[PDB]
Amino acid sequence: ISEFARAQLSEAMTLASGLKTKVSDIFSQDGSCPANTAATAGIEKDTDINGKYVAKVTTGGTAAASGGCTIVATMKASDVATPLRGKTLTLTLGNADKGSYTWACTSNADNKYLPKTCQTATTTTP
Amino acid sequence: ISEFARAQLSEAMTLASGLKTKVSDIFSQDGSCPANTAATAGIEKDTDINGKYVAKVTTGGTAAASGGCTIVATMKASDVATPLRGKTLTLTLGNADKGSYTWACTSNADNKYLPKTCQTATTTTP
DSSP states (O other), rough: OOHHHHHHHHHHHHHHHTTHHHHHHHHHHHOOOOOSSSOTTTTOGGGGOOSSSSSEEEEEEOOOOTTTOOOEEEEEEOOOOOOOOOEEEEEEEEEEEESOOOOEEEEEGGGGGGGGGGOOOOOOOO | OOHHHHHHHHHHHHHTTTTEEEEEEHHHHHHOOOOSSSOOTTTTOOOGGGGSSEEEEEEEEEEEEEEEEEEEEEOOOOSSSSSGGGOOOEEEEOTTTSOOOOOEEEEEEEEGHHHGGOOOOOOOOO
16 A cells, blocks of 8 residues: 555645544534635635645535534645545534544545544344 | 655755855855845845744855855744754855856755755775
8 A cells, every 4th residue: 555645635634634623613612514615704615725736625514413524635636636526624623512623534535545543334134 | 764854954954055046156256255134235134034834044155266154944942843943954165166056055054954966975994
């Protein structure tokens, strides 16, 4: 498994991680999840949040007891490892009602490119 | 051996290489070696010249009839491959008093991470 591909999805996480404080602070202060398809109270426009491999980072989600707000980074459509083109990786706030905030990682890309922490689970059934 | 680590050093080479015509212009113009500890005529301060894996690119070196000007790249101390952390790669002017200017490449990183034109040599002895 390519460390070049691993590293690109690594940009995404870091650019998304970059908004935890900003998103959890609005959730627990105003009760809602902020969305940035337009710039919004201290948070930049999703298409303005980017780097070498990330095209945009969008906030949103649906407010719930423990959290729910989502931070979705979208990969560029080019100059990126072919399987990752246009894919997304998603951080979700949780435990908002229990203590320290948690942020579960998920992605719609192949687990072979993700960190262990961002991978799905697959098992057999009866 | 990691192509990904190889790729990190290659960025230093590239960024250091992008200052060769300027440094060369100064030597040919003033018989001197410019020092960019701070921005100076035409060239940005060393830390303003960086990249994903590269922290700074400094010019300096000691002037002679053959040239002697150096352009050194310093890798970041983190977010880079651990054997390359804070390692340097140097471009050095020569041949100024014999013919076409040349730039020799040296580095203090391990040879297993370097292009062939930048590796040192080790021989045996009696």
